[PDB]
């Protein structure tokens, strides 16, 4: 439901952002005020990633 998959690689630009790899699964906690950033959890930790870089799976 909040289970997602990464569409593209994203390299953390610091400031509480999280690196993710295409194909990786994430759990989504929420979004920032404009929906552009998504706060997510993966095996590598927790942080903000682009909302457009991920999508629900299953």
């Amino acid at each position: 439901p909040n289970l997602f998959v990464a569409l593209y690689d994203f390299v953390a630009s610091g400031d509480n952002t999280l690196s993710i790899t295409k194909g990786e699964k994430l759990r989504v906690l929420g979004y920032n005020h404009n929906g552009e950033w998504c706060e997510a959890q993966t095996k590598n930790g927790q942080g903000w990633v682009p909302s457009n870089y991920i999508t629900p799976v299953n």
Binding site: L7, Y8, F10, S13, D15, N16, T17, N32, H33, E36, W37, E39, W48, V49, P50, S51, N52, Y53
Partner: peptide
């Protein structure tokens, strides 16, 4: 969340 915009997807 970051104050700047995220990169656009490709």
């Amino acid at each position: 969340a970051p104050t700047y915009p995220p990169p656009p997807p490709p």
